[PDB]
Design an enzyme around this catalytic site. Structure first.
Site, PDB file in Angstrom:
ATOM      1  N   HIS A   1       2.360   3.210   2.971  1.00 46.99           N
ATOM      2  CA  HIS A   1       3.759   3.620   2.719  1.00 46.99           C
ATOM      3  C   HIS A   1       3.774   4.610   1.588  1.00 46.99           C
ATOM      4  CE1 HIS A   1       2.849   0.446  -0.153  1.00 46.99           C
ATOM      5  NE2 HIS A   1       3.637   1.172  -0.984  1.00 46.99           N
TER       6      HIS A   1
ATOM      7  N   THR B   1       3.586  -2.971  -7.007  1.00 45.39           N
ATOM      8  CA  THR B   1       4.646  -2.246  -7.738  1.00 45.39           C
ATOM      9  C   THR B   1       6.034  -2.619  -7.276  1.00 45.39           C
ATOM     10  OG1 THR B   1       4.684  -0.284  -6.286  1.00 45.39           O
ATOM     11  CG2 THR B   1       3.055  -0.329  -8.132  1.00 45.39           C
ATOM     12  N   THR B   2       6.158  -3.483  -6.274  1.00 49.69           N
ATOM     13  CA  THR B   2       7.441  -4.077  -5.883  1.00 49.69           C
ATOM     14  C   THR B   2       7.342  -5.587  -6.024  1.00 49.69           C
ATOM     15  OG1 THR B   2       6.875  -4.278  -3.501  1.00 49.69           O
ATOM     16  CG2 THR B   2       7.934  -2.219  -4.228  1.00 49.69           C
TER      17      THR B   2
END
Ligand SMILES: NS(=O)(=O)c1ccc(C(=O)N2CCCc3ccccc32)cc1
Ligand SMILES: [Zn+2]
Length: 258
Positions: A92, A196-197
């Site tokens: 992504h 990072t999420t």
């Protein structure tokens, strides 16, 4: 009231549901090029994507994932700082509302227009859900995007986005070759970090390539037409889906190159 990227639910709020947000090995980070040390012990990265089997593309409400068949060792990452074999599960991107921002990692505080993340899990843990609970469970290959010439290998991705505009929409996405997204050089920086999420788990060996790929303005504009919202809901353009740099704390970023 779910996490996202807005004023009310963005990165500075994540700690309330995910206290690890303030942890000791959070990502992304600024890469200070003068402080990163060449490590002659690091091996060349081995990116083996010839037998990769893409399956589907999904708008998940925070980005779009291109998903791969990870039921066997087909597309794998090994070498570099890694011990063992890491299987590609998805890629992504993160990107901005304008060219001057969008990457998660930064380089001497420079933000790129976007950042590609090729996500891999350590096969010694048997499945992805087990791997994310381990300090060495994931390896994410990070590639910066700058705006210039078009990347021909990205166009198939750009062209399907109209069909997955809104959250929860997916489309068949077979026979996509992620080799087409790589730069010439596999020179990299590496450090231990996190997703990072949310859930922000501290399970990632980051490997960030020095050489950006170039994409066209038209290509990135098409990323920016996606939607965070579901079908029929008020339109919220999917832009600025990046987490800023986090404190480096007690970590060393190592360079594979002199
Ligand atoms: N940006 S990145 O490359 O660091 C990244 C972030 C999150 C993930 C990831 O699998 N998710 C995140 C959200 C849902 C989720 C739920 C349970 C376990 C992992 C996950 C994968 C890669
Ligand atoms: Zn990511």
């Amino acid at each position: 009231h779910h996490w996202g990227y807005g004023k009310h639910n963005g990165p500075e709020h994540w700690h309330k549901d995910f206290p690890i947000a303030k942890g000791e090995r959070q990502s992304p980070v600024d890469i200070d090029t003068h402080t990163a040390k060449y490590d002659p012990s690091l091996k060349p990265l081995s990116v083996s994507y010839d037998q990769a089997t893409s399956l589907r593309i999904l708008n998940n409400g925070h980005a779009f994932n291109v998903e791969f068949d990870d039921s066997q060792d087909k597309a794998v990452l090994k070498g570099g700082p890694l011990d063992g074999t890491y299987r590609l599960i998805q890629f992504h991107f993160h990107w901005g509302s304008l060219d001057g921002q969008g990457s998660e990692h930064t380089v001497d505080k420079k933000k790129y227009a976007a950042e590609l993340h090729l996500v891999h899990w350590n096969t010694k843990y048997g499945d992805f859900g087990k791997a994310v609970q381990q300090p060495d469970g994931l390896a994410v290959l990070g590639i910066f995007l700058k705006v210039g010439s078009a990347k021909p290998g990205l166009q198939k991705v750009v062209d399907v986005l109209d069909s997955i505009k809104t959250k929860g929409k997916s489309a068949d996405f077979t026979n996509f070759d992620p080799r087409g997204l790589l730069p010439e050089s596999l020179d990299y920086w590496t450090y231990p970090g996190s997703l990072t999420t949310p859930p922000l788990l501290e399970c990632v060996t980051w490997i960030v390539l020095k050489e950006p790929i170039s994409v066209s303005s038209e290509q990135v504009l098409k990323f920016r037409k996606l939607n965070f919202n579901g079908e029929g809901e008020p339109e919220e353009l999917m832009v600025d889906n990046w987490r800023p740099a986090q404190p480096l704390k007690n970590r060393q970023i190592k360079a594979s190159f002199k």
